[PDB]
Design an enzyme around this catalytic site. Sequence first.
Site, PDB file in Angstrom:
ATOM      1  N   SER A  48       0.768  -1.225   0.000  1.00 63.26           N
ATOM      2  CA  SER A  48       0.000   0.000   0.000  1.00 63.26           C
ATOM      3  C   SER A  48       0.809   1.290   0.000  1.00 63.26           C
ATOM      4  O   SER A  48       0.221   2.348  -0.210  1.00 63.26           O
ATOM      5  CB  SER A  48      -0.895   0.104   1.232  1.00 63.26           C
ATOM      6  OG  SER A  48      -1.939  -0.829   1.254  1.00 63.26           O
ATOM      7  N   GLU A 146      -3.679  -7.203  -6.823  1.00 62.06           N
ATOM      8  CA  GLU A 146      -2.638  -8.097  -7.330  1.00 62.06           C
ATOM      9  C   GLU A 146      -1.222  -7.594  -7.025  1.00 62.06           C
ATOM     10  O   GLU A 146      -0.299  -8.407  -6.878  1.00 62.06           O
ATOM     11  CB  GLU A 146      -2.786  -8.311  -8.833  1.00 62.06           C
ATOM     12  CG  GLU A 146      -4.069  -9.029  -9.163  1.00 62.06           C
ATOM     13  CD  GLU A 146      -5.293  -8.146  -9.390  1.00 62.06           C
ATOM     14  OE1 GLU A 146      -5.300  -6.882  -9.217  1.00 62.06           O
ATOM     15  OE2 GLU A 146      -6.302  -8.777  -9.759  1.00 62.06           O
TER      16      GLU A 146
END
Length: 268
Positions: A48, A146
Amino acid sequence: ATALTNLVAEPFAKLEQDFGGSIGVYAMDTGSGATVSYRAEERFPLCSSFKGFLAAAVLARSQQQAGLLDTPIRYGKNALVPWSPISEKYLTTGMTVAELSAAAVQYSDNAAANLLLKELGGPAGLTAFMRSIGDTTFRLDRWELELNSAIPGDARDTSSPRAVTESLQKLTLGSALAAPQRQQFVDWLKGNTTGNHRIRAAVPADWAVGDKTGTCGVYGTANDYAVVWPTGRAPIVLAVYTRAPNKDDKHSEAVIAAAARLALEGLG
Ligand SMILES: [Cl-]
């Protein structure tokens, strides 16, 4: 004479031992120019943590597209993926680009990040922004979820601690962005909610910190980068990334904070 980098390194290597994986660290003192560097040019998955740079790239676009930030993006259920707590809440209305950016940065919202990626022309658009500021290392290839696969040996969706720190410095402290956009990035980073057990845990409470975290959920792969402002001193920029060889090796926030403490204390 220069630093004995073997001595600066030693406690990071000891931390790696118990952790069972690799720790990558780069820290830069913007006042003195001092640095701490441990595996700083090795690649680690972004997870992230790409979302901070995503918001910077959105801010850069807004410089050439007046009122982009207050433009509502109204999406369907295909935008949604797990770990998207804010975008899920506003499915029935939509969210402005600014709201999406803040959500991606401060809540690590996945769908918000994919929406903003679309605005930039996909993963390649964000990578192109990073190239425009002289980051030749950063690569975002895939989308949420992904991009989190973190498969050993895969260079897709990675960067280095050093390149992350250098890029963060350019964007938050340097003049790479116009001053309002620079300050907006800083404010979004300062309001992150997901980082309290990582770099922030190493920093005295009364010093301002802006950060962005990543947690791939596999391969012991997790990270944080931050700008730290010690009161009355020049700010520090730093990045701490981990990975480990087995899918089931656990990441550790404690390791990240301890590496951050070691980096911060080693400056000068
Ligand atoms: Cl849809």
